[PDB]
């Protein structure tokens, strides 16, 4: 059900509402550990990998084993758990285009080796100190070398979204010929525009039908989610994510939001939607970066209503202010009470507390609530005290 | 292999040059006989149906049996040939939403009955004198009745492209529930804009995955070909054509152009491309309507070059001025000579004629050619006379 292969889809569902394929690669353990201030222990890494396997992630990028001894050891443990059937996702190891990295990737027995290289002109010049042609040779050699160990090879075209497009096409032919079966198109600095992303992937998939494409999208301009969905429309079959929007700088497409947007817009369930909160909370614990309360899907406030008009509507039909039911994600709605509330919301909360107030008493409590501008919420004890102030009586709920 | 089922495709081929499907329904025998001044005899109908089958058309719309006794007889003969396996295409009979048309369509044993009804506001009011709700009931009953005879049913939404879209969706739900497996979307007056056609079919195919859609596109604004390719982009699996642009008023999408355009842009071959000229000619003969010389693909001049600069280029590499090789369609290139010519062209024609002239003599001939403003063609006899007039030698087998 929450399996570890591709999910069939048909693109966007109809307005006012299966030949294509898509799945998740989660990079919490690679991209995600490149977040300033974030490091994971080996045990933490392993615990996260198991959680990602359990919710049905297709691929886990477990790290770049040359980076440090602990990353090597965490990847090894994960591959061992995979070999034992405890973990079921495909395990990907990252690699520079250097023989050493590749040999290490091969020796730990990863399912896939992802070789990256920067193929924009700034990267070729400033980062690699190389020419277009020399880069083509290095990439061909390293991809072939990795292939010859009998492991599947992805090539990541770093800064592809600012690269010369003709060169990008040449890069892809090169790595295809050298044995790569997947190419990741990396929007390294988050500058893709969604409608253009769709076009890009439509073009690439039409040109290279023997290759499957990944989208790796950074959120520098706040459009990572929209870019990954657009890529999927265009035929990308793997979307890279991290839990909680972890990664370099502002991070990449966040798993919980991507998964929800794919459910709503494409009608598919690429991971266990009901377990997003639990996995997000786990990563939050080990990463030490708190999710803001406004984070989509898993955020504290995602299904919390405030304005009186909204709460009144929700009490009649939650769909009025809820894009999908909270239960879709294993959550429940709530509402808060402050000076923005109204009579229906206040009545409903008193009803929950078992306190019967008259219509005019409700008016008086509402007026008292609205008389103070700088109170952030009214807790039940506050509301009980307000009622007492109106009834003169000592005022049953189990929470 | 020019078989008689759907052809697989993947939409447009990449810039700088399989989950979808498409095939041809040719309506030369139905829509095409609705061209002013065109009628076919029963014999000619049968012979056109055979040629349509031979080139690999998926569906032949062989006529509307209720219209006349000779149409009824032609269809009956076509169906007999289908039974005998001479004709292999699916045979479609047209029908109004009237019990008699349907019984008759059932009675001749057509493979499919196509019931049409006008679902735009002007059609409902001025032509059917009915309401949206009544139309729905009539359409439901008639489709159901046709389906109860155990025959496949297409519903044609006439004037769909100017109908209320919400109503069109209700129409399609209605006929689908009544048992229609195909719906034809008719751009009856040719007002579809191509990019909007793609969107229309994309939307309809996503909403009704258990129906296949046809496009029937008229050429009133010259965009029938662009419209049918756009419909195919969007998921239409049947494109309606006629040979030679036959049909009411200005006709519908012409088979030879649709077939070429699909080959170039989608990379597929939905009929035998090398037989297009032959079938166009046959239909030209029986319709009595000549194709203009500029008609694409099969026209006299489709692969005939004129300007000196073009002919010089083509003589070095024909691809310079040919979208695809003429042999694609079993044809050959040519060029003409008039005041627009140049030295490479004139030299080449003399070579064909076996006449050896010096460059100086070519220049003189060329100057004489360019001195006659109103000579339409220098035919070979004329060229031989020009060469004789320059060389003083005998030069002049056609
Ligand atoms: C990999 C790592 C151990 C290398 O450390 P290092 O050898 O001290 O090198 P530096 O970090 O100073 O990085 C630059 C070197 O890598 C090279 N390089 C960068 N990307 C490369 C690639 N895709 N293929 C080959 N070489 C690459 C640079 O040209 C440079 O080489 P140089 O030492 O000859 O100048 C270290 O950078 C690291 O731990 N990085 C974290 C992982 C990471 O950077 N991931 C990048 C994802 S794009
Ligand atoms: C079909 C046929 C013989 C009808 O002849 P007719 O009975 O003398 O009627 P007319 O052609 O004058 O008028 C059409 C009649 O059919 C009705 N009609 C039109 N389209 C219809 C449809 N899709 N379903 C049912 N009835 C329809 C009209 O309301 C009108 O009815 P009326 O007689 O009550 O006014 C005759 O119109 C004919 O041969 N037409 C050629 C085929 C044709 O018209 N094809 C159109 C494809 S869109
Ligand atoms: O391997 C990938 O797809 C992404 C590499 C990366 O982090 C980037 O270039 O942004
Ligand atoms: O049957 C069809 O598909 C087309 C009907 C027709 O004649 C039209 O509306 O143009
Ligand atoms: Zn990245
Ligand atoms: Zn028509």
From Swiss-Prot, chain A:
Disruption phenotype: Cells lacking this gene do not grow in MM without or even with lysine, but grow in MM with the simultaneous supplementation of lysine and arginine to the medium. Furthermore, the mutant strain does not grow on MM supplemented with lysine and glutamate, but grows with lysine and ornithine.
Enzyme class: transferase
Cofactor(s), by name: Mg(2+); Mn(2+)
GO terms assigned for molecular function: 2-isopropylmalate synthase activity; homocitrate synthase activity; metal ion binding
Domain Pyruvate carboxyltransferase: 22-277
GO biological process: L-leucine biosynthetic process; lysine biosynthetic process via aminoadipic acid
EC number(s) recorded for this UniProt protein: 2.3.3.14
Binding positions for 2-oxoglutarate per the UniProt entry: 30, 94, 154, 188
Activity regulation: Inhibited by lysine.
Active site annotation, chain numbering: 310
Keywords, alphabetical: Acyltransferase, Allosteric enzyme, Amino-acid biosynthesis, Lysine biosynthesis, Magnesium, Manganese, Metal-binding, Transferase
Residues that coordinate or bind Mg(2+): 31, 216, 218
Pathway: Amino-acid biosynthesis; L-lysine biosynthesis via AAA pathway; L-alpha-aminoadipate from 2-oxoglutarate: step 1/5
Catalytic reactions on record: acetyl-CoA + 2-oxoglutarate + H2O = (2R)-homocitrate + CoA + H(+)
Domain writeup: Contains an N-terminal catalytic domain fused with a RAM (Regulation of Amino acid Metabolism) domain at the C-terminus. The mutant enzyme lacking the RAM domain is insensitive to inhibition by lysine, indicating that the RAM domain is responsible for enzyme allosteric regulation.
Family: Belongs to the alpha-IPM synthase/homocitrate synthase family. Homocitrate synthase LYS20/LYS21 subfamily.
General function of this protein: Catalyzes the aldol-type condensation of 2-oxoglutarate with acetyl-CoA to yield homocitrate. Carries out the first step of the alpha-aminoadipate (AAA) lysine biosynthesis pathway. Does not display 2-isopropylmalate synthase and citramalate synthase activities since it cannot use 2-oxoisovalerate or pyruvate as substrate.
Protein name: Homocitrate synthase
Phylogenetic placement of the source organism: Archaea, Thermoproteota, Thermoprotei, Sulfolobales, Sulfolobaceae
Included range, full protein: 7 to 382 of 468
């Amino acid at each position: 059900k929450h399996h570890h292969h591709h999910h069939h889809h048909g693109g966007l569902v109809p307005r006012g509402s299966l030949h294509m394929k898509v799945g998740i690669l989660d990079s919490t353990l690679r991209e995600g550990e490149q977040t300033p201030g974030v490091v994971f222990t080996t045990d933490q890494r392993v615990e996260i990998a198991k959680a990602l396997s359990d919710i049905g992630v297709q691929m886990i990028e477990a790290g770049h084993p040359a980076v440090s001894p602990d990353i090597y050891e965490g990847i090894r443990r994960i591959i061992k758990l995979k070999r034992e059937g405890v973990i079921k996702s495909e395990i990907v190891a990252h690699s520079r285009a250097v023989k050493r990295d590749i040999e290490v990737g091969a020796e730990i027995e990863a399912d896939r080796i992802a070789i990256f290289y920067g193929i924009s002109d700034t990267h070729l010049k400033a980062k690699h100190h190389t020419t277009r042609d020399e880069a083509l040779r290095s990439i061909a050699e390293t991809v072939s070398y990795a292939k010859s160990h009998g492991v599947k090879v992805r090539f990541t075209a770093e800064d592809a979204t600012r690269a010369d497009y003709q060169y990008l096409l040449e890069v892809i032919k090169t790595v295809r010929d050298a044995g790569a079966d997947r190419v990741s198109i990396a929007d390294t600095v988050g500058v893709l525009y969604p409608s253009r992303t769709r076009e890009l992937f439509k073009d690439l998939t039409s040109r290279f039908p023997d290759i499957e494409f990944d989208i790796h999208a950074h959120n520098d301009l706040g459009m990572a989610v929209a870019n990954v969905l657009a890529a999927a429309e265009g035929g990308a079959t793997i979307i890279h994510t991290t839990l909680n929007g972890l990664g370099e700088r502002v991070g990449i497409a966040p798993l919980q939001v991507v998964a929800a947007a794919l459910k709503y817009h494409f009608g598919i369930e690429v991971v266990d939607l009901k377990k997003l909160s639990e996995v997000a909370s786990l990563v939050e614990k080990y990463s030490g970066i708190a999710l803001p309360p406004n984070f989509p899907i898993t955020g504290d406030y995602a299904f919390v209503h405030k304005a009186g008009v909204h709460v009144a509507g929700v009490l009649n039909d939650p769909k009025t202010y809820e894009f999908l039911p909270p239960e879709t994600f294993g959550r429940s709605r709530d509402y808060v009470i402050d000076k923005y509330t109204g009579k229906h919301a206040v009545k409903d909360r008193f009803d929950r507390l078992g306190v019967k107030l008259t219509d005019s008493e409700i008016d008086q409590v509402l007026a008292k609530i609205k008389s103070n501008p700088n109170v952030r919420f009214y807790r039940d004890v506050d509301l009980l005290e307000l009622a007492e102030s109106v009834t003169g009586r000592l005022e049953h709920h189990h929470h």
